Amino acid sequence: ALGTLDFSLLYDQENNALHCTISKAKGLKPLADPYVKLHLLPGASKANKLRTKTLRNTLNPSWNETLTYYGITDEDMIRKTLRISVCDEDKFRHNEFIGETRVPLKKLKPNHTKTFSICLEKQ
């Protein structure tokens, strides 16, 4: 198993915003310098891309960091999927993919934070 990621998603409907709180991961399996990348599916523009800071020398990182998309409508909630990738930063070399999961936004309710604990998959 590649590891387990904990996170929370909030559709801030009044503000057309999706707040993605990346909390922590447990038992990552690349040592590692973990960081998390977010991509909104149906989405090519690098505006669809958000990313957490990088942590050092940990297989159980705690970012506790919130990343926010704006321009999110109910239609986007129905149509889109949040891709969440955990990667390993190898400075001056090649960054390695660790694991991912995806959350269809239609599973979220407006103004209600939903928390997730997911065992990561490969690509």
CATH superfamily: C2 domain
Query: How far apart, in Å, are the first and last alpha carbons?
Result: 13 Å
Q: Output the CATH class name.
A: Mainly Beta
- The CATH topology label is Immunoglobulin-like
Structural class: mainly beta
Architecture (CATH level 2) name? Sandwich
Spatial arrangement of strands, main beta sheet = 5-2-1-8
Rg from Cα: 14 Å
| Major sheet | 4 strands, antiparallel
> Helix-strand pattern, N to C?
EEEEEHEEE
Based on DSSP secondary structure assignment, what is the total number of beta strands?
8
Strand content: over 45%
Instruction: Determine the number of helices (DSSP H or I, runs of at least 4 residues).
Output: 1
How many domains make up the coordinates? Answer: 1
Shape: globular
* Overall helicity: under 10%
